[PDB]
A paper describes a structure:
The crystallized protein contains residues 345–710 of [name] from [name]; several N- and C-terminal residues from most monomers could not be resolved from electron density difference maps. CdsVC displays the same fold as homologs MxiA from Shigella flexneri, InvA from Salmonella typhimurium, and FlhA monomers from S. typhimurium, Bacillus subtilis, and Helicobacter pylori, with four distinct subdomains (subdomains 1–4). Monomers of CdsVC align with RMS deviations of 0.26–1.68 Å; the primary differences across the nine subunits exist in subdomains 2 and 4, and in particular, the cleft formed between subdomain 4 of neighboring [name] protomers, as evidenced by the high B-factors observed in the structure. The closed, planar ring is stabilized by the buried surface area between subdomains 1 and 3, with an average total interaction area of 1127 Å2, as well as several salt bridges and hydrogen bonds between conserved residues, as noted for MxiA. The CdsVC nonamer has an inner pore diameter of ~60 Å, with the total diameter of the ring ~170 Å. Residues lining the inner surface of the ring, which correspond to subdomain 3, are highly evolutionarily conserved across prokaryotes with T3S injectisome machinery and flagellar T3S, while residues along the outside surface (subdomain 2) are highly variable. This suggests a conserved functional role, such as substrate secretion, for residues lining the pore, while divergence of the outer surface may allow the export gate platform to form multiple species-specific interactions. As was shown for MxiA, conserved residues lining the CdsVC pore also include several lysines and arginines, which are critical for secretion. Density for the loop connecting helices 12 and 13 is observed in the CdsVC:CdsO25-110 complex but is unresolved or only partially resolved in the structure of CdsVC alone, despite this structure being at higher resolution than the CdsVC:CdsO25-110 complex, further supporting the idea that these clefts are flexible and become more stable when ligands are bound.
The export apparatus is composed of a central, nonameric, ring-shaped inner membrane protein, termed the export gate ([name] in Chlamydia species and SctV in universal nomenclature). The export gate does not directly engage the sorting complex, but is linked to the [name] by SctO, an ~140 Å coiled-coil that is structurally similar to the central stalk proteins of the rotary ATPases- the F1-[name] γ-subunit and the V1-[name] D subunit. In T3SS, SctO is the key link between the export gate and the [name] and is poised to transmit mechanical force between the [name] and the export gate. Presented in this manuscript are structures of the C-terminal region of the export gate from [name] ([name]), both in an unliganded form and when bound to residues 25–110 of the Chlamydial SctO ([name]).
Numbering used by the authors:
A (entry chain E), B (entry chain D): 363 to 658, 662 to 708
The structure:
Amino acid sequence: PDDYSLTLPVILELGKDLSKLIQHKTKSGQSFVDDMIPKMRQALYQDIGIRYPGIHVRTDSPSLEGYDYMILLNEVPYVRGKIPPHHVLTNEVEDNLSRYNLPFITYKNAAGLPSAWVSEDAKAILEKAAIKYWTPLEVIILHLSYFFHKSSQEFLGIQEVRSMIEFMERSFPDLVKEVTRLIPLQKLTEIFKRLVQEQISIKDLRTILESLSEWAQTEKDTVLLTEYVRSSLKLYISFKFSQGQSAISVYLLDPEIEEMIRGAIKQTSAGSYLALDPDSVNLILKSMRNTITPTPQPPVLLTAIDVRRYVRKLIETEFPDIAVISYQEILPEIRIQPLGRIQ
Amino acid sequence: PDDYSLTLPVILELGKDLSKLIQHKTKSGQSFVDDMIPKMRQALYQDIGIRYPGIHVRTDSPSLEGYDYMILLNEVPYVRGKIPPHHVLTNEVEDNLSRYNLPFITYKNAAGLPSAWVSEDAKAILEKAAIKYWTPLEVIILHLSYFFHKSSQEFLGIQEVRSMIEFMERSFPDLVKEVTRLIPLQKLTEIFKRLVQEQISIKDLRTILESLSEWAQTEKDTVLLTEYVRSSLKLYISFKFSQGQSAISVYLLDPEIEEMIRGAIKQTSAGSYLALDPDSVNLILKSMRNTITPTPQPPVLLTAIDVRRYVRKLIETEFPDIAVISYQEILPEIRIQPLGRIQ
């Protein structure tokens, strides 16, 4: 009646028609709310450390267009989106679609999503040309998943990290003890947050904790401890950023740029930051814009060990999805296919 | 659901046909999952001082061909492999097989494993000729064993070392009490890990603990404690690297090299550095390359007591499998056969 209520972390509101739409089942007899959304949460938990909250679905939204949907983060609207009626979504090129495929509607719901919508009546031909397509419900799932991917910091806090560490305690009481006797819980969560901010999964807790148990005996800096955990994930990072190929394809930095960055460190009374020379930062960004070819996959930038974290923070603003990795973080025997040298 | 899952250390994924294959007991009635894998684990735990994890077997994998298999370390793919259909593996010289009118398929699954595959129809012939062969299931076990051996450090951490010390506590309460009173669990874990990192078995926990119980009264450096444990395993080391003969075959160092290494940074830093000139490290590495005739078993490099650990930390990157031993680790009556110094 008049107790407090906890704010709901994620709301999905649907217009009258999409609400009418979540009543069917896919050709595989699965439910949007009981199967598709849980499987998305499960996939996200496998892709990075986080166990993301459930999705509260509000049907027949009054403030919504029947074919519109809205995502609310902590009961505040985060993103609106639209579904072109009676279509399926596609990721096809603009010269390939000039293969008599009439519906070339471009409407981008989000950055990381496809935008080439095609009539549902064309499913048959889409399946005959090896064109993958997403049904409108699957597009909603794509967008929810993208949302979770870009906003991990919103769902990985002190309580959530503690819950995962406690689960670890059941079979690793002594490793956790050795990890809780050196790094207090708040510092631990800061470290996990830095990891997932750069798409480093924190799912392999035994590896990460074993790493911290080693490096936390000597170093207390949370940023450095994070670097070490990264260097502990050689197999994972190599497999992820090489996309499972025999060779990681990366961009490099001209040694001149690296040494120039190296010469901009700070005194670490509190922390050591980048003494970003304005004009030099805008010159490195310009060389990156004019060297890294745009993408459909995000590109990978391989740098020296001692500058990687700085390169990330120098570039994270314009190139937020570019992965900056270091030699300390790839397998010793890994094949490297250089693509360019930023100058 | 809402709950976490513990990452699986070892997954073996099998295509359709290999999956069918593990459903049949061998000629002698043993099961791939119930007998072969357990016995391999027991053997590894008999050679190295590690208890290796169980293997989770995923059949009818979607991403694998009928005769393909994959090994995942902590749910990241480690390696992929093939089995030539309806064949058995042999180590025969290819030219000899040809001379026996036996068509052969060449395929090397992992480093140091045989590669001459022969139709299973040839078993009888191979038996009468006393030619060794491995069935497909046996080859998967061979590759699994190579994997576990290369990945030992992945299974030897704080919780696992604690588990060992626990088992030791049941019959050696006071010896454990003496060692753990002097060495914390994390330091103990470091020492065991150093031992297996250089192929020294930690199966004889009584000898290792007794050694530590003696030397931890006086010495706290974990590296020096490790050296002492190494010298306490004289019998094990002599038998292993002499391969059981009345004489160990070794390479030696020039007195000039030993004296030159002997300039080593030993500060009060819980472990001493080794400050040798870069070009000098490259001159010792060059002399080793030009003096170590490659091996068809690994070679042994015999050094003086006070330089052994440094010699290792100097050659381990380019010469990773060379066993570096000292006069302190071999039996006094084991005859030293010298294969030339290092210029």
